[PDB]
Amino acid sequence: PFTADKGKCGLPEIFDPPEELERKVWELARLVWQSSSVVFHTGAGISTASGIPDFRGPHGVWTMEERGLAPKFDTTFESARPTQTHMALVQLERVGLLRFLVSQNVDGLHVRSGFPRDKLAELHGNMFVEECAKCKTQYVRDTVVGTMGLKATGRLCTVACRGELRDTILDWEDSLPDRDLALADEASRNADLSITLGTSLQIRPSGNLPLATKRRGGRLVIVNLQPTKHDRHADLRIHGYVDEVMTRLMKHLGLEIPAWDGPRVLERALPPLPRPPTPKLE
Ligand SMILES: Nc1ncnc2c1ncn2[C@@H]1O[C@H](COP(=O)(O)OP(=O)(O)OC[C@H]2O[C@H](O)[C@H](O)[C@@H]2O)[C@@H](O)[C@H]1O
Ligand SMILES: O=c1c(O)c(-c2ccc(O)c(O)c2)oc2cc(O)cc(O)c12
Ligand SMILES: [Zn+2]
C-alpha cells in the first residue's frame, strides 16, 4: 500500500490543435454511426470538470503526493454534479448508441446521473454503495459510506437478514468484484467499438479491457489529455478535454445532452428512445 506502484504520474498533456480536434471528433462520429456494439470506458478524467482531481494528471492525487503536495477538491462527493460527459453517456444509452459502460471511478457520479446500473460495471467500487456480506444486496446511499477496503460500515441489512453492511471500495490487495469484471469483459470482447474517456489505462486488468475489443477486428478510440498505456493500439487518439469532445460528438449525432434532475438511481435501463437517422457513410 505504502509501496503500491502508482504508475506513471504527471506526464505532459497533449492538445490537438482545433482543425485536427474537429476532424478527429468527426471520425469518432463516423465510427459511432458504423458500430453494432459501442462500449465506453471511463476514468477519473471525466470528473475533473466537476472539481474532483484525477490520480495521475498534473495536479492528480498520486502526482501531488510524489511532489510532497496535496490534491485539491473543489467539491464534496455529495455536492459534485455530473459533467456534460456524464450526461452525454446517459443520453447515448437512452437512444441505444451505448451498449455498456465500464468505469474505474469510485466517485458515484454515473449512478447519481441516472445511468442504469444494469449497463454499468463499477470495477473499483462506489463511495455511496454498501453491500450485505450475507445476501450481497447493495444499498445506494445519499451520502458517502464512511469506510474503504470492504470494511463493516456499522449498518445492517434490511431485506425482509441483519447481514453486516460493507463498503465496496477495493484496497490495493482486493481483486475486482466478479460480477462487474465478468460483465465488463463480455461487453468489451463483443464490442466492435471501445471508446476510453479520461483514463490513463495503467491499472490491470481494468485498463486492458478496451484491448479485448481489438480481438475479431474491433476498433479502439482513446480520448485523454495525457499519453495512455495503450496509445499504440488505438485506431484514433483524441487529445482534448472530454467535455469538448463529447459536446461536439453529441452535436454531430444530433443529440441533446439531457438535464440533471439531481441525484437519482436507476436500477434497470428503460426502453430505448428514438434517435436521428444515420448519415450515408461511403
Ligand atoms: N477534462 C479532461 N479531459 C480529458 N482528459 C482528462 C481530463 N482530466 C483528466 N484527464 C486525463 O484523465 C486521465 C485520468 O487518469 P488517472 O488519473 O490515471 O485515473 P484512472 O481513472 O485511469 O485511474 C485508474 C485507477 O487508478 C487509481 O489508483 C484508482 O484506483 C483509479 O480508479 C489522465 O491521464 C488525464 O490526463
Ligand atoms: O476516499 C477517498 C477518495 O475516493 C478519493 C478520490 C480521489 C480522486 C478521485 O478521482 C476519486 O474518485 C476519489 O480521495 C480521497 C482523498 C482523501 O484525502 C481521503 C479520502 O478518503 C479519499
Ligand atoms: Zn442481507
CA distance 163 to 225: 44
Here the cell at position 230 is: 495503450
CA 166 – ligand 3 centroid, Å: 11
Burial of 213 (0-12, 13-18, 19+ CB in 10 A): buried
Here the cell at position 198 is: 479520461
Q: Whose CA is nearest to atom 31 of ligand 1?
A: 104
Cβ contact 188:215 at 8 Å: no
3-state secondary structure of 266: strand
- 62: phi then psi, degrees, rounded to nearest 5: -70, -45
Identify the CA nearest to 144 among candidates 162, 169, 127: 127
Identify the CA nearest to 55 among candidates 172, 174, 189: 172
3-state secondary structure of 68: coil
245 sits in which H/E element: helix 242-253
104 belongs to an annotated ligand binding site: yes
Cβ contact 217:195 at 8 Å: no
Here the cell at position 252 is: 454531430
Cβ contact 238:222 at 8 Å: yes
Here the cell at position 9 is: 504520474
* Residues marked as catalytic: 124
Cβ of 103 less than 6 Å from ligand 1: no
3-state secondary structure of 221: strand
CB proximity list for 2: less than 8 A, separation 6 or greater? none
Cβ contact 42:102 at 8 Å: yes
47 belongs to an annotated ligand binding site: no
CA distance 196 to 214: 13
Q: Could you identify the residue written with the cell 460493507? A: 166
Work out the number of other CB atoms within 10 angstroms of the CB of residue 72: 10
Q: Which of 72, 127, 145 to mutate to test the pocket of ligand 2 (most atoms within 8 A of CB)?
A: 127
For 144-201, give the DSSP string: --S--SS-EEEEE------PEEEE----TTPPPPHHHHHHHHHHHHH-SEEEEES---
Cβ contact 279:252 at 8 Å: no
Cβ contact 190:212 at 8 Å: no
CA 153 – ligand 3 centroid, Å: 14
103 belongs to an annotated ligand binding site: no
Cβ contact 206:251 at 8 Å: no
For 83-143, give the DSSP string: PHHHHHHHHHHHTT--SEEEE---S-HHHHEEEEGGGEEETT--TTEEEETTT--EEE-SS
Cβ of 105 less than 6 Å from ligand 2: yes
CA distance 91 to 109: 15
CB neighbour burial string for 222-237, b if at least 16 within 10 angstroms, e if fewer: bbbbbbbbbeeebebb
3-state secondary structure of 43: coil
Here the cell at position 108 is: 458515484
Q: How far apart are the first and last CA of the chain?
A: 52
CA 48 – ligand 1 centroid, Å: 9
Burial of 278 (0-12, 13-18, 19+ CB in 10 A): exposed
Task: Looking at the CA of 166, name the nearest ligand.
Answer: 3
Cβ contact 25:245 at 8 Å: yes
Cβ contact 15:185 at 8 Å: no
The length of the chain is 282
223 sits in which H/E element: strand 219-223
Q: Whose CA is nearest to atom 35 of ligand 1?
A: 57
CA distance 97 to 28: 13
40 sits in which H/E element: strand 38-42
- How far from chain centre, in Å, is Cα 124? 11
Cβ contact 28:245 at 8 Å: yes
Cβ contact 43:198 at 8 Å: yes
CA 44 – ligand 1 centroid, Å: 4
In the chain the domains, ranked by start, together with CATH numbers, are 17-124+174-269 (3.40.50.1220), 125-173 (2.20.28.200)
72 sits in which H/E element: none
3-state secondary structure of 213: coil
Q: Whose CA is nearest to atom 9 of ligand 2?
A: 54
Cα–Cα distance list, 44 to 133, 197, 225, 242 (Å): 28, 9, 12, 11
